[PDB]
Structures are given as C-alpha cells and as structure tokens.
Design a protein around this ligand. Sequence first.
Ligand SMILES: OC[C@H]1O[C@@H](O)[C@H](O)[C@@H]1O
Ligand SMILES: OC[C@H]1O[C@@H](O)[C@H](O)[C@@H]1O
Ligand SMILES: OC[C@H]1O[C@@H](O)[C@H](O)[C@@H]1O
Ligand SMILES: OC[C@H]1O[C@@H](O)[C@H](O)[C@@H]1O
Ligand SMILES: [Ca+2]
Ligand SMILES: [Ca+2]
Ligand SMILES: [Ca+2]
Ligand SMILES: [Ca+2]
Ligand SMILES: [Mn+2]
Ligand SMILES: [Mn+2]
Ligand SMILES: [Mn+2]
Ligand SMILES: [Mn+2]
Lengths: 233, 233, 233, 233
Amino acid sequence: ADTIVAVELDTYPNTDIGDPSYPHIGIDIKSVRSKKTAKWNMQNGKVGTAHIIYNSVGKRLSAVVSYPNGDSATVSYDVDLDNVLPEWVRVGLSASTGLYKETNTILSWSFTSKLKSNTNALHFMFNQFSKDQKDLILQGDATTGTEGNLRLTRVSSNGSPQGSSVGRALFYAPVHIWESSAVVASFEATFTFLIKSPDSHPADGIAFFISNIDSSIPSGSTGRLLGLFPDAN
Amino acid sequence: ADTIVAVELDTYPNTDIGDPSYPHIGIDIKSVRSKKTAKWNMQNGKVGTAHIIYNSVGKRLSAVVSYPNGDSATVSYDVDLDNVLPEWVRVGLSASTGLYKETNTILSWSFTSKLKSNTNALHFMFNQFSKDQKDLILQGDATTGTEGNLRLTRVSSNGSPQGSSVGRALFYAPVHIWESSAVVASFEATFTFLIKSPDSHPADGIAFFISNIDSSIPSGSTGRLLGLFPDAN
Amino acid sequence: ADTIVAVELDTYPNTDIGDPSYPHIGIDIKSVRSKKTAKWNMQNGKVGTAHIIYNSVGKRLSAVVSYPNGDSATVSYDVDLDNVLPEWVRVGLSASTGLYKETNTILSWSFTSKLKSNTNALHFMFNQFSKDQKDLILQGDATTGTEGNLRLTRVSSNGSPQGSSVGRALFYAPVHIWESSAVVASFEATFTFLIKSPDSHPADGIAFFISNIDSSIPSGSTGRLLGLFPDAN
Amino acid sequence: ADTIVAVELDTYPNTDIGDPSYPHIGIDIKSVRSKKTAKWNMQNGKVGTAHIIYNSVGKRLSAVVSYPNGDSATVSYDVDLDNVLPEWVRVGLSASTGLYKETNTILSWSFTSKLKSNTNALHFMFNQFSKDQKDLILQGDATTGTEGNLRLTRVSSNGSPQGSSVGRALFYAPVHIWESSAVVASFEATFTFLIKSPDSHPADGIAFFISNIDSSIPSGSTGRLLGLFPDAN
Ligand SMILES: OC[C@H]1O[C@@H](O)[C@H](O)[C@@H]1O
Ligand SMILES: OC[C@H]1O[C@@H](O)[C@H](O)[C@@H]1O
Ligand SMILES: OC[C@H]1O[C@@H](O)[C@H](O)[C@@H]1O
Ligand SMILES: OC[C@H]1O[C@@H](O)[C@H](O)[C@@H]1O
Ligand SMILES: [Ca+2]
Ligand SMILES: [Ca+2]
Ligand SMILES: [Ca+2]
Ligand SMILES: [Ca+2]
Ligand SMILES: [Mn+2]
Ligand SMILES: [Mn+2]
Ligand SMILES: [Mn+2]
Ligand SMILES: [Mn+2]
C-alpha cells in the first residue's frame, strides 16, 4: 500500500533478497531490493553521518555515508521522483534489528525541501531530540530519550540493542516534495547515527525514507525489511 | 483555554475594548487588548508585508508592517515568552471581518524557529499556497485557492469580502518555541497580505499568532476578536 | 590562464564554434564549446530565472532556465568539479553583446556554497543591487544601477543594449568550493534576468561562472566568448 | 578613525578604564568603555559560544555567552545601529593578550546579515578554518591552523598563549548592514571559542565587531583595547 523511497544503511547482507554480500548503502525505490548500492564499511560504535541529496533538475538521488576517519561510501541513482512519489509525503527515519541487532541511534536529523517556481520550503533540524517531541511521529519501537537521541529500535535498560525491533520517526508535517509547476523541487536530508553492536554480526540498518503521508510500519517488517516494506519484492 | 501570543494588524478601531482610535498594529499577549500598538495606515488593496521577530536574549517581540511606498509601522514589546507560551506551540495566521469587512488574503508566509544550545530549527516558507495544502491546518472560513493565496476570510464568488467571517491557518507541525536549556530561542515570521475593502470602513484585520498546539477558533471570535480570543478581556 | 566553469544562457548560435543552431543553455567546462546544451527559447523582454545546482555526491552539474509561462530548458552534465576547479574560486555572472545585442539585466542573484565534513557555508542573496555594491566586483561594462539591477552589459541612456559589450560581476569573497576532506561540497546559484532586444537577432547571452579568484575578463572576449574565454577552443 | 561596534568577551577587569571588577561581556559602541556589560564567568579551557543578535525593528543589540554546563551571561543594549555604522561594514573577530594572556581560539564562526525590503542576505559559516583561508582577512597575530581553528592571538609552538598579542579575522566581503529603505536589517553572529590560560589571571578577551570596511588594527591596541580601539575613551 505505502509508496516508499529510501536510502538504506544496510548493515546486514540478506543475499537471498538482493543484498550484496557486504554491508551496503542502498537507494530503494518502492522495493527493498535496492536499485543501486555501494559497499559500506559500518564502523561499530562510531558516529556516522548520512547525507541524501535530490533535485528534479539532475534527477539523481544520492547518498553518502561517512565516518570521522573519513571512510565514506556513496551511492547515486537516476530516477524521476515525480513519477514515484505522491505530491505530498512524509519524511522519516526507520530502523530494524532481526535475529541480529544493533543500536539504531540517531543523534541528529535535518531535512530541507524546496519547491522553486518559474518558492515553498520546509526545513527542520534536530540536533537534540527530546522526551516529548511533538513534531515527530514515532512508530513501533522508536523512542526519543532525555539523552537527546532518537532511538529508533528497542534498547534494553542496560545499553543493549534488542532484536526483532522496528521503529520509525516521521517528521509531523507533510512535505510537498514535488509540484508539477515547480522548476526545481529538491530535498536534502542529513542524519548522524551511532550503530553499535556486540552481536556476531550487526543488523539490520537505518534508512531515511519518504512515503505517502499516512504511511505506517508495515506488518512483520522487522529485520531485513528495515521497517519500510511488507515484503522483499 | 488557549494561550495566545499575537501580532495584530488591526484595521478597525474598537475603542470600547482597548484599541486606539486608529488602525493599528498590536502585540497581544494572552489578551486582545494589545500590550503595545502603533498607528498603522492600512493601504487598501495594496500588498503589505509583516515581519515578526523575537529572540529570548533581547526578549523583545517586534513587528513591522510596511507597504511598497515604504510607509511602515512598527511595534515592540519586552516580554519573556518562556513565561507565556507552552514549550510547544503551533504558529499561524488568523483573520476576521465583522460588521465591516475586507479581503484577508495572505500571499506568502514564512516562519523560522530556532533553539540554539550551550540547534533545533523549523522553517517553512509559503510563497504560493495550494488547493490541498497538507501542512496547513485551515480553520473556520480560511481557504487556500488555486491563485496560490491563503484567503483567511470568506470572499464571495465575485471578489467580495463577506462579513462575520473568521479563518485561520496554522502550520501543521508543532514548533518547539522554547526549551529552558536553549541559550537562544528565536523566531521570525514574515507574511505578505492584501487587505482590500469597498466597505465604509475595513475591518477587522490579520494576526500572526502562536498558541498551544490544540488551539482552535474560539466561539464567536469574529470581528474585533480577530479569531484569537473568546472575549475582549 | 583562467579556469572557468559556467552555465551559459546562449541567445545566439555561433555554429562555427560549437553552438547548436538554436539559442541554448550550456554547461561549459574550461571551454566555450559547451560539454552539454539544450535548446532554449529565450523570451524577449521577459524575466527569466536560472538555477544552477551541483553536489560532489551525484557529481552532476545542472541548470534549468525557465520563464513565468513555464517554458523551461534544462541541461545536466556529469563532471567532477574537484578535478576542474581550484579549491578557492570566485563566482559570478558574465554577459556579452557582439554584433547583435541585448539587455543583460540581472534582477537577482543568489548563491550557496557548502562544505559538509565527515560545515562551512557561504550564501549571498541579491534581490536588489545598489549603486555602490561593495561585495561585488564589477568588470568591463557591468554596472549596478539605482533601479536595483545589475546591468552586465552597456545599455545606452535611452534604454538600448549596446554591442561589443562585455561585463561581469563576481561576488567579492572567494568561495571554498571544494575541500578534499568534505564529504559533500555543493553549490546552488540562482539568478533572474531580463534579456531584451530590438535587434534582428539577440546576442550573446548571460553565464553564471566559477573561476580562479584572480579571474578577470579575457582580452577581446565580447560577443560569443560570453566574457569567459580568451578564444573558442 | 575606525567606527567600531562590538561584543566583547572581556576576561580581564580594567577598572581604570570602565570595566567592572569582574570578567564581563560588553556591548561596545564606538568606545571600549562598554555601554552595557554583564558579569561573565569565563570557564578556563572550556569551549564557549557567543551569540550576537540585532534587528533594526527592536533596535536592541544582544549577546549571550554560554558554556556547556549552561552557565551563560547575557547583555543587551538599545541602540540604533543605522546611526552608528556606515552602510557597509566588515565583520570580524578580534583578540588580545597584554601582560596577562590566554589562548584566543575560535573554533567556529557564523554570521548572517539580512536586508528585507517593503531581500539581500549574506551568510557565512566557518566550523573549520583552514591554513589558507581566502575569504578571511587576518590581521596582526591571527592565524588559521591545520587544526581547523582560528587562533586570534599568538600561541607558542608548545601550546602557550603569548602576551602583548593582538589579532583579528574579518570576513572578506563587505556586508551591507543597513539600507535606509530596508524595513528589517538584521544580523546574527555566532562563534565558539576556547580561552585557556595558565596565567595568574587570563586576559584580555575576544570581541565580535563590525567596522568600516577598510578597518585595521589600531596602533598599540593590544591588551585591554581588545584590538578594536586606539585608546580607552
Ligand atoms: O530475521 C533475520 C534477520 O534479522 C536480522 O537482525 C538478521 O541480521 C537477519 O537479517
Ligand atoms: O462586530 C462589529 C465589528 O465587525 C467588524 O467588521 C466591525 O468593523 C466591528 O469591529
Ligand atoms: O561578434 C559577432 C557576434 O556578436 C554577437 O552579438 C553576434 O550575435 C555574434 O555572436
Ligand atoms: O597591558 C596590561 C594588560 O595586559 C593584559 O593581558 C592584562 O590583563 C592587562 O589588561
Ligand atoms: Ca539487509
Ligand atoms: Ca480592532
Ligand atoms: Ca553563442
Ligand atoms: Ca578588560
Ligand atoms: Mn540492502
Ligand atoms: Mn487592536
Ligand atoms: Mn553556446
Ligand atoms: Mn570591558
């Protein structure tokens, strides 16, 4: 039912559903089988940053994920998002653990959407999330804590990522991400994250996603479905 | 019930409830009887611009309303808004006609809210409103048209401001307008408007306002209550 | 000597040096023979808008030029600008008339450059230029007038574009347009222009360009060299 | 000769020239004897943040300096800066040691200037300074290092603040800080700093300042003159 576009930070290779056999970042257009991926060295316990960039001129959706040591992974995909997304969307962040697990801590998240004609703009920046974050819609296991973080997946009292968890935070306001009369419709989103695991292998990752506004966590979408898709089609 | 802070562009002098005997801009803190006003020459049928500026450092809320010929009216009031507003608010625009009437056309509206610590930010800009504006909450008579305008009060098919009308548009997302740990909590809001009247005297004006998030149009708040207050206390 | 990257709004087809046989927008990398162009219907006497967008992730430089009736022309080119431009640049606007002529009036110009690490940012917006614009470097025939415009090419007292004219306005501050440790280095530039001609055919166009900081108008670079190149190589 | 407006972070009480007998932040209008000050607990070796905020509506210039533990000091002064500053200015940061000394390390500096009519804007952000910072004008002892810092006063190879030092960094581009037709002319500037001393008492402080564009370090303006004034008048 939901239309999803997403950038996934995919920590766990689900080879039987498309993933490459490494941790990877992915552009996902209406399917968890990414249209495009890049090998990504997730750095356990380090604070990472994702940048997602799209404009309707170049019609190239790009993401880059880096860490402070400067290793960074980048992915791009040429796609006309006007053809994919409804005019109004919500934007958000999504995370999963499955059998294997990890902290899916967002430390900051920012987003800018513009429509420039022949301008409407939405921008939010969160560098600190709060306990009762009234412009965020939390779903599933996502919590904002007093440590100023967005914890997208269940952590246990004593600091531990719980498995089978799925959580999302959508910004409260619909965003008008395209308008057929706009000459430029662009969006940028940036988030920093801390994936930490003690697990044999971390899983399952974090995605920034854009969806129809009424979007919600799909049924059994934990683990490899990254809280975005009802299935692996 | 609602806590209101507002800048009013008050086209019609309701002297029996505080107004001065001229059209005026006003800062309103929890009462339609402005704490501070300035004589304002509303220019009939011309596009005007309001700017509202507040920061928690100076703790001075200011507005200036100007037109293109450069006549402008300005008002300031020293007030600690942390003491007035709940932490989370909605922001919006409100308009009224009563016995006398006017177009209450908003052509653009922009808003920036920041919390800077020892940053969270929301910014929206509308330069064009659309028929189905999913990040706006319209109340009462407010409509967004295909002419890209926000028509806060009922206009009649043939271009005429109807009386007894009250309408508001709140931005969809709550805004976090103060946070006791922020060192600067500031907001700016800007809107352009076109008040046009054929009436013996225009009424009643436009306000930018900030309220509790669940705020709605008070009972019988048309005319001089500018769609903000249940009474004239 | 100068390294140029530019988006040209090329009103006059110089077929013997690469142009297509129509008015065109072009991406120019170190040569006036554009790497990529798109047919552009210049609308005589109408206010146009150019948007130039680049980020080091997608590594796609794009421009779109539109007018209010919504006709718009778009061009994109995949290029790694880190390989082309020195780290510090100036940004600007350039215009030419030759044998044929036109007003090369810039009504507004804005620019945003960011370096985001694993942020530095410059943004300027001019919606009104002034007589003595101390953050602009004017070259050749470019003048800022009291009408708030940037007139890149000589106009005659009585409203007429003079021929053989070349003029540029560079923003005063060097911009740091790439930094090998930045994970995103992006820039956007936007300008509105009014090309007006009574001439048999308008010429020669407007470019937004990025150059080494000490860049100046090349010798005899009027007409088809758009004030950017010493020759047509 | 120079016209200065400044916010001083004054670490050393020069009581014989106006200072209070504590470390203080100060608003300085054309004189080092601040028009207004507030006791400021400089936290030795900690990273501090200054915010300076002015708009021509409220006509209140404010600064707040805080540290991470949240102690913050605030100062405001009602002043019409149109009456004080020339239309075009440069903006910058200034520091001094005298007999007593301190590191005057700027870790980031940002500035936004707007003119809104009846908009021109300049914004720069430096979160990382570089060795050869081509949009900064360094004066006296100010150096940008490879550690990404702006070191306004001489530090010695082995980490030590040298005395008698004075250094400033002005942004390269003049800023148009007022325009008599603007209805709002506002500016915000933000900088983080690290003042560290081993000295019996730290001195002399950091100022953000705005000056005529050709401004330079006054003769013998080390120590208590904070690199802004030729004398203590
Ligand atoms: O449901 C099995 C899935 O759970 C994840 O945590 C594992 O890594 C695997 O993708
Ligand atoms: O209800 C009477 C009120 O209606 C307004 O339109 C008049 O100007 C007056 O304030
Ligand atoms: O120098 C000849 C050139 O001058 C331009 O104005 C003409 O259109 C042609 O490109
Ligand atoms: O020149 C004497 C001054 O030098 C400063 O470092 C001292 O604190 C005092 O203000
Ligand atoms: Ca996977
Ligand atoms: Ca009234
Ligand atoms: Ca040509
Ligand atoms: Ca002192
Ligand atoms: Mn995947
Ligand atoms: Mn009133
Ligand atoms: Mn060409
Ligand atoms: Mn002092």
